[PDB]
C-alpha cells in the first residue's frame, strides 16, 4: 500500500495473508469459514512452494494468540484466467479446516448485485504489499481510502487503453495506491467487498496508471459454485 497508514489491528477481521514457504506473497479475503478469495496470478507466482493462509494477523513476524496459519486443501483459480492477461484474475483457496471465528477472524459479505460502484466513492484497500518503490515490505497491515475512478477515464489511451472490462473497476493511484504484494487483497466500499486487487506488472503511485480491481459481483455464480 502506497501513501497509506498502519491499519488498526484486527479492525479488518476478513484480511488474509496468502503465503508461500512462510513468506507473504498476496493479500486475501475470508469470504466463508473455509474459503479465502485472492488473485489467480498469485498461484502462478507461488508455483512449487507450500501455499498457506494466515488469519487473525496484524504483524507478520510477531506471534499473537489471534494469529493462525492454515494449510490450503484446494486452490481453485478461475478457469478463464491466463498468465498473459489480467481478466478473470480470481482464485479461491480452501483451508485445511473451517477457520476459528472471533474478534480477529470473521468472513466479509461480498457484493452479489452486479451494479458498478459509483465513481468517486471512497473504498478501503488493505495489504502487506510494498510501502515504497524501493520495495519495502511492512511488517504490519497497511490500508488506504481510495476514490473509485470511472471506467471511461480508466480506459483512456494514457491509462489502461480499453483493458478495463465491465468485470473490472479502477481507483485513483496518484501517490496513493495498492502495490506489489497487495494483489488478491480486498477493496471494501461501505462495508461490502466490491473488488479484489488485480495482479500485473503495473507500477504503483503513478496517476497515469490507475489501480485495477476485479469486480466480485461479476463472478457471483462462480464464487457460489466453488463455496458449495
Amino acid at each position, epitope marked *: 500500500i502506497l501513501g497509506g497508514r498502519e491499519a488498526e489491528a484486527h479492525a479488518r477481521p476478513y484480511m488474509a495473508s496468502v503465503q508461500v514457504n512462510g513468506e507473504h506473497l498476496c493479500g486475501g479475503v475470508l469470504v466463508a469459514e473455509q474459503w479465502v478469495l485472492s488473485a489467480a496470478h498469485c498461484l502462478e507466482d507461488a508455483a512449487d512452494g507450500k501455499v498457506q493462509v494466515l488469519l487473525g494477523a496484524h504483524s507478520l513476524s510477531q506471534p499473537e494468540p489471534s494469529k493462525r496459519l492454515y494449510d490450503v486443501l484446494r486452490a481453485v483459480p478461475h478457469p478463464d484466467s491466463r498468465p498473459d492477461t489480467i481478466d478473470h484474475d480470481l482464485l479461491l483457496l480452501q483451508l485445511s479446516e473451517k477457520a476459528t471465528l472471533g474478534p480477529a477472524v470473521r468472513p466479509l459479505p461480498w457484493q452479489r448485485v452486479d451494479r458498478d460502484v459509483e465513481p468517486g466513492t471512497l473504498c478501503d484497500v488493505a495489504g502487506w504489499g510494498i510501502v515504497s518503490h524501493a520495495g519495502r515490505r511492512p511488517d504490519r497491515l497497511q490500508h488506504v481510502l481510495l476514490p473509485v475512478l*470511472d471506467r*471511461a*477515464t480508466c480506459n*483512456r489511451r*494514457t491509462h489502461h*487503453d480499453g483493458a478495463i472490462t465491465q468485470r473490472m473497476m479502477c481507483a485513483e493511484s496518484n501517490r496513493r495506491d495498492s502495490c506489489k504484494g497487495d494483489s488478491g487483497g480486498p477493496l471494501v466500499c461501505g462495508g461490502v467487498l466490491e473488488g479484489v486487487v488485480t495482479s500485473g506488472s503495473r507500477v504503483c503511485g503513478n496517476r*497515469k496508471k490507475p489501480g485495477i480491481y476485479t469486480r466480485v459481483a461479476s463472478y457471483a455464480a462462480w464464487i457460489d459454485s466453488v463455496l458449495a
Partner: antibody
Amino acid sequence: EVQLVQSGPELKKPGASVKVSCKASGYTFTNYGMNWVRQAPGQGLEWMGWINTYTGETTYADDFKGRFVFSLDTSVSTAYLQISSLKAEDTAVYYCEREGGVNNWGQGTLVTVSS
Amino acid sequence: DIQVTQSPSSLSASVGDRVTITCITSTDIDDDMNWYQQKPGKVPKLLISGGNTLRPGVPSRFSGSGSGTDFTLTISSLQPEDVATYYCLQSDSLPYTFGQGTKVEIKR
C-alpha cells in the same frame, strides 16, 4: 466489430446552430469516452475535446471553449456535437473518435456555413 | 494547454528511402506520443501509440522513438502507398494535441 456512424453533411447559415451525431456499436458505449476532431478544408487535424461517456464530464481544447458543446444519449449509444453561433470559418469535417482500445473513428461529417 | 511542434511541413523522398518526422512537446510527456496517417480523402488511422507501440496490422517499416519531449516517426523503406499527411498527437493528459502535420510525397 466496432463501428462509429456519423450523421450526414449539413449546410447552415451564419449565426445558426448545428447538432452532429456519432452512433456507436460493437462495444459498451460507457466503457470508452469520445473525442471530437475538426479538419477545415485542406488544413490539419485539431483536437476539439473529450466527453466522458460514463459520467458526462467534458474537456475542451482552448480554441473550442465557448460555442462547442458535447452531449450524450447513452440509451441509443450516441454522442453529439453541437456548434452555436456558426461562423464561415466553422466550415469543416468533424470526426468522432473512440478513446482507447483498438483505434476507431467515425467517417466524418462535413458542415458548411454559408448564406 | 500542452503544445506540439511538428517538422518538416512537407518532404519528397523516393521509394525505399527512410523518412524521419519529428515532434517536440512544450513539456515532458513521458512516452505518451501517438502517430496518425491520413491518406487523401480518408479517415485518420493510428499507426503508433504510447511507448512507440506499433499497432497490429501496420507494416513493420513504421516505427516510433523518443521519450520526454523529443519524438520521431521513421518510415524505413518508403512505399508508394505511404503517400499521406502524418500527424503526431500527444496524449499525456487532457486536452490532447495534434502536431501541424507533415505531407509525405514520393519522388519518382
